[PDB]
Amino acid sequence: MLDKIVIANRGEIALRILRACKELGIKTVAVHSSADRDLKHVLLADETVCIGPAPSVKSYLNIPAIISAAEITGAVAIHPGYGFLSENANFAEQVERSGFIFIGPKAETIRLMGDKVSAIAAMKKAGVPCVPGSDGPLGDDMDKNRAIAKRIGYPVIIKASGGGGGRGMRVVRGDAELAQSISMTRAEAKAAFSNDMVYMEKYLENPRHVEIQVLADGQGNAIYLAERDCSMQRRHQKVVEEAPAPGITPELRRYIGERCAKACVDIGYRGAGTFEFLFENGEFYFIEMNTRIQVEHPVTEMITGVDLIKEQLRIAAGQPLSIKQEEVHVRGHAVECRINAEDPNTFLPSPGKITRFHAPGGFGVRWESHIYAGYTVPPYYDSMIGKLICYGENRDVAIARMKNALQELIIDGIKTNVDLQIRIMNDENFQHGGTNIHYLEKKLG
Numbered sequence: 175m176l177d178k179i180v181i182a183n184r185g186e187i188a189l190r191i192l193r194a195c196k197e198l199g200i201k202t203v204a205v206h207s208s209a210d211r212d213l214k215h216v217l218l219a220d221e222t223v224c225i226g227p228a229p230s231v232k233s234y235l236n237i238p239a240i241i242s243a244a245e246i247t248g249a250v251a252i253h254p255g256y257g258f259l260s261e262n263a264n265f266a267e268q269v270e271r272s273g274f275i276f277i278g279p280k281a282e283t284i285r286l287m288g289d290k291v292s293a294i295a296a297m298k299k300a301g302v303p304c305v306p307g308s309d310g311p312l313g314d315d316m317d318k319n320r321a322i323a324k325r326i327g328y329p330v331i332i333k334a335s336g337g338g339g340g341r342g343m344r345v346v347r348g349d350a351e352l353a354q355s356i357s358m359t360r361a362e363a364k365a366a367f368s369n370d371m372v373y374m375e376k377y378l379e380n381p382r383h384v385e386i387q388v389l390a391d392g393q394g395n396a397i398y399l400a401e402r403d404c405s406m407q408r409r410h411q412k413v414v415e416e417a418p419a420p421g422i423t424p425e426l427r428r429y430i431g432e433r434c435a436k437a438c439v440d441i442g443y444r445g446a447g448t449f450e451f452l453f454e455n456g457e458f459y460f461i462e463m464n465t466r467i468q469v470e471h472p473v474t475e476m477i478t479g480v481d482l483i484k485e486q487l488r489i490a491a492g493q494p495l496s497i498k499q500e501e502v503h504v505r506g507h508a509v510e511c512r513i514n515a516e517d518p519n520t521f522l523p524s525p526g527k528i529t530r531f532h533a534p535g536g537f538g539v540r541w542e543s544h545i546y547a548g549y550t551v552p553p554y555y556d557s558m559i560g561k562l563i564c565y566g567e568n569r570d571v572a573i574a575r576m577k578n579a580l581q582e583l584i585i586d587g588i589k590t591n592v593d594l595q596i597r598i599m600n601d602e603n604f605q606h607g608g609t610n611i612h613y614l615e616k617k618l619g
């Protein structure tokens with residue numbers, strides 16, 4: 175097992191990885207900004223290093239500082255969690271080059287799946303269902319591009335090859351708007367990503383968001399740990415997630431899971447990963463791979479028994495997968511509510527000090543958060559401050575548990591989405607199950 179790792183993150187996931195390390199006897203190093211000295215996991219870590227000032231760009235995105243910190247402390251591995259540097263191929267490359275274990279995929283793999291055009295092609299080659307699309311970048315020839323649109327069928331959606339998740343992409347319904355939209359999406363991507371490559375895909379009107387969890391060693395073994403539904407979302411941001419996805423049959427699960435597992439073998443995937451699919455009319459369509467742990471991992475954990483973070487550390491230590499596919503069983507149901515520090519009336523992030531905190535408890539209730547009474551939420555980072563996960567023998571039990579658990583939660587001194595969460599749990603369509611990626615905004619206005 176790894177002697178000592180650096181937790182290249184903050185917030186709830188940093189604490190999450192800390193417990194995992196602790197349970198395994200692994201020494202922890204907390205690298206933090208100057209504004210994050212009072213994080214729970216930083217106060218718990220065996221060792222702390224300040225890697226720079228408050229802004230993420232000079233701290234948590236500061237590669238040289240992170241590696242110096244891993245160097246000074248005598249660490250052997252670096253867990254990047256999610257966001258920040260987790261999908262930065264050059265970070266992963268430099269870690270390995272510096273001689274550390276990178277807790278995640280090889281640099282090439284991140285690069286392959288971090289370019290949506292190259293990602294979709296590797297998925298197509300491995301036999302992963304994708305959205306009908308241009309099967310390459312778009313040219314400057316507008317006769318071609320109007321015919322590609324015809325070949326697939328409007329509506330189509332111009333997307334950025336560098337971007338993703340609503341970032342630099344727009345819907346086109348006729349020929350007249352295609353001319354303007356392509357060159358606009360080209361420039362928008364040239365803005366934040368320094369990549370002007372764009373492609374075309376069929377625009378699905380009303381899809382659900384179903385994604386598959388995978389684990390893989392570096393060594394020709396790969397498994398899938400069922401799926402999650404994450405359709406309930408706001409401006410392309412997940413607000414609620416659940417496992418398994420309502421309506422998905424054991425036949426379909428086996429089908430898509432086997433393909434995802436196979437894809438891991440074809441691309442040489444290592445560590446945890448998720449294949450994100452839009453799900454419509456009984457069909458799946460790949461849209462991007464997150465080559466990293468996800469925020470919503472705990473739902474999969476509850477229903478499968480698998481400590482995903484601990485498997486990540488085991489795979490990193492070079493241990494082959496101890497768990498065979500036929501050992502992984504879906505049992506019960508889990509829902510996760512993202513707890514955000516935000517104005518319920520404006521959705522603007524609401525930082526500040528927490529004057530009274532009370533977490534929910536009881537059978538089936540899992541609370542993942544770094545927050546405590548007296549803790550100050552800084553304005554510099556993501557608004558998500560906690561994750562509440564409720565498991566039960568079935569979906570209705572899990573939902574009823576979430577309802578009661580959200581009414582026990584107290585976070586005073588800052589504004590929270592808690593009461594939106596309460597309102598989403600009570601939604602009569604969410605209770606039937608299977609609402610699509612537009613549902614939440616339709617319910618709101």
Ligand SMILES: CC1(C)CC(=O)c2c(N)ncnc2C1
Pocket residue numbers: 305331339340343375376377378379381410452461
């Ligand atoms: C993120 C998103 C914009 C979601 C969506 O509506 C969509 C779609 N409908 N067809 C293709 N790709 C996508 C990606």
Ligand SMILES: [Cl-]
Pocket residue numbers: 256257467468469470
């Ligand atoms: Cl995530």
